Amino acid sequence: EHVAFGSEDIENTLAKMDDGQLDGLAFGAIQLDGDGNILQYNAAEGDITGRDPKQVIGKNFFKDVAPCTDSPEFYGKFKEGVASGNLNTMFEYTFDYQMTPTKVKVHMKKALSGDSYWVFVKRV
Ligand SMILES: *C(=O)/C=C/c1ccc(O)cc1
Structure with a gap:
């Protein structure tokens, strides 16, 4: 998929993209509900973190998957x-x-x- 990280209209480009298409991105992509439950999780993210995408879908990102992000600097935002x-x-x-x-x-x-x-x- 031909989309750059940080693109100004990224939400339009990704809107309603299915799991397979999300796996084509050059960067990790996770979709969360307002409670932090994982709705989508792409292959590039799994490559960065080691998580198996289909296994983390339905888990709470902040409570379960990524406790290091349960902080004012990430979860708080x-x-x-x-x-x-x-x-x-x-x-x-x-x-x-x-x-x-x-x-x-x-x-x-x-x-x-x-x-x-x-x-x-x-990655940086
Ligand atoms: C800290 O606990 C971060 C963990 C993490 C970040 C992003 C992911 O996709 C998975 C785990």
């Missing part, structure tokens, strides 16, 4: 965005739960329709 109904933030972070610590750039953006939220990830 996410929940503020869910509560506001608007989110577009980009920041670096280190992923380190049961994995070699890995520095990444994270872009969280509210999905176009409904109430879903993207978490995009690339």
Whole structure:
């Protein structure tokens, strides 16, 4: 898929893309509901983190999968965005739960329709 990390209209491009198409992206992509449950999780993300995508779909990202993100610096930003109904933030972070610590750039953006939220990830 021909989409760049951080693209201004990424929510339109990805809107309603199915799991197979998401697996074509150059960067990790996770779709979360407003509670942080995982709705979609692509192959590039699994390559970065070791998680098996179909296994983490339905789990809570903050509670279960990624406790290192349960902090004001990641989850706090996410929940503020869910509560506001608007989110577009980009920041670096280190992923380190049961994995070699890995520095990444994270872009969280509210999905176009409904109430879903993207978490995009690339190595830095
Ligand atoms: C910290 O616990 C981060 C873990 C993590 C981040 C992103 C993922 O897709 C999976 C686990």
